[PDB]
Design a binder for this molecule. Structure first.
Ligand SMILES: CCCCC[C@H]1O[C@@H](O)C[C@@H]1n1cnc(C[C@H](NC(C)=O)C(=O)O)c1
Lengths: 218, 211
């Protein structure tokens, strides 16, 4: 199995900059017939992949020439001379020379902007849900950059992961930041056997966790 | 032009089977094999294998032998793929493609045992206490199937909003939304959550009250 490793797995750029994506095959992808079936795809949310480059360096019909591909044998590279907005999305390299055919893991080309810490908000269970016997504690981590982040819950000091459901938004269309919601669901019974609920967020904009918290009986 | 028509979305039960179609037009069906690609939501791409319409020859990725079965019909220029013994692992979007330049629109397969269930909607007010900006939330829990459409004040208040992708709970979904406004605006004014679940023809409105 020819595995295709592409680097990086995430690539922040500013409109107008140059963009280079690497893809290396764990082995030669020269097909028995003499051709090298290395392709590059760009896929946008809710769409199917669109071919950009085939046979290493050939542009497909309708593809802008600021896209060029190169490399040989085991090392391949895709370059975007100057990034436009229609270029944002996930890129994939693919090899169709040896079965099973394989794709690279994908490289998301996103936008660069200034680092920004997350605005952390915590929400106790609503009276309604509590009347219904359930108890969800919500914690929003909004408007941060870059995208990597980690949330940690502590109930009466105890670290908790069982019952935590996370969701992440795509890069914002207006300010280029990322957000995240973390929700801890317990039963009302369980919820009432405890007092302090805490959500800590560690983000690269600080070595110190941003911690939000509340005491149930307040 | 080359066109690849794939069958509509499939909502099927675990353990059963499903067979999707890929109808080709615009070129000579037997002049190319027909590849199938699997993509699990928010993740990578996987080559399932291919069928050569001309001689019905096939080649499968060892990972999909027995799980997928590729067939083709020359009389109607239509290729088919059958997935047996479904599991939630088979939920994903399947594509067919004669070659790199032309892919079908894909067929979404959702493997689940759930029944249509309207969502529970709870308002999320801040903890009793103030700064100059307030963040309010709305949490929609345990609905099925997807999707639901959420708005704030019917769509008027659309700035400073973050609606997160839904995620599976049991075999039910759960999603949330947060909107941040200046405290000069809330609770002096009004702010209500509008959740519409087209599958159960329900549209709930829950407004955020101070605690
Ligand atoms: C999802 C689209 C994948 C397209 C894969 C084909 O495009 C090129 O990379 C070549 C690759 N391909 C791989 N096998 C084939 C068909 C095969 N041809 C060769 C030269 O092995 C045959 O005729 O059986 C085509």
């Amino acid at each position: 199995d020819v595995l295709m490793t592409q680097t990086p797995l995430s690539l922040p750029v500013s409109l107008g900059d140059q963009a280079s994506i690497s893809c290396r095959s764990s082995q030669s992808i020269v097909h028995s017939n003499g051709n090298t079936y290395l392709e590059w795809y760009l896929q946008k949310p809710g769409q199917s992949p669109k071919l950009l480059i085939y046979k290493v360096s050939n542009r497909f019909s309708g593809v802008p020439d600021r896209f060029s591909g190169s490399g040989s044998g085991t090392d391949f590279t895709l370059k975007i001379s100057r990034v436009e907005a229609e270029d944002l999305g996930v890129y994939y390299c693919f090899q169709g020379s040896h079965v099973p055919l394989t794709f690279g893991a994908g490289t998301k080309l996103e936008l660069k902007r200034a680092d920004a810490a997350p605005t952390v908000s915590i929400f106790p269970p609503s009276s309604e849900q509590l009347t219904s016997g359930g108890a969800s504690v919500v914690c929003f981590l909004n408007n941060f950059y870059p995208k990597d982040i980690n949330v940690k819950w502590k109930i009466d000091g105890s670290e908790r992961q069982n019952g935590v459901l996370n969701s992440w938004t795509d890069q914002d269309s207006k300010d280029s930041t990322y957000s995240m919601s973390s929700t801890l669901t317990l039963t009302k019974d369980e919820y009432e056997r405890h007092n302090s609920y805490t959500c800590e967020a560690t983000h690269k904009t600080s070595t110190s966790p941003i911690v939000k918290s509340f005491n149930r009986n307040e | 032009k080359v066109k690849l028509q794939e069958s509509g979305p499939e909502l099927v039960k675990p353990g059963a089977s499903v067979k999707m179609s890929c109808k080709a037009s615009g070129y000579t069906f037997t002049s190319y094999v027909m590849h199938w690609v699997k993509q699990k939501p928010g993740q990578g791409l996987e080559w399932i294998g291919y069928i050569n319409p001309y001689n019905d020859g096939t080649k499968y990725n060892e990972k999909f032998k027995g799980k997928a079965t590729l067939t083709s019909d020359k009389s109607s220029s239509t290729a088919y793929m059958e997935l047996s013994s479904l599991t939630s692992e088979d939920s994903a979007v399947y594509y067919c493609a004669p070659y790199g330049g032309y892919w079908g629109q894909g067929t979404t397969v959702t493997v689940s045992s759930a029944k249509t269930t309207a969502p529970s909607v709870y308002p999320l007010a801040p903890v009793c206490g103030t700064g100059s900006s307030v963040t309010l939330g709305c949490l929609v829990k345990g609905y099925f199937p997807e999707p639901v459409t959420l708005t704030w004040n019917s769509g008027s208040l659309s700035s400073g909003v973050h609606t997160f992708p839904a995620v599976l709970q049991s075999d039910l979904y759960t999603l949330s939304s947060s909107v941040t406004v200046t405290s000069s605006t809330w609770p002096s004014q009004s702010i209500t959550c509008n959740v519409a679940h087209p599958a159960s023809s329900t549209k709930v409105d829950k407004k955020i009250e101070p605690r």
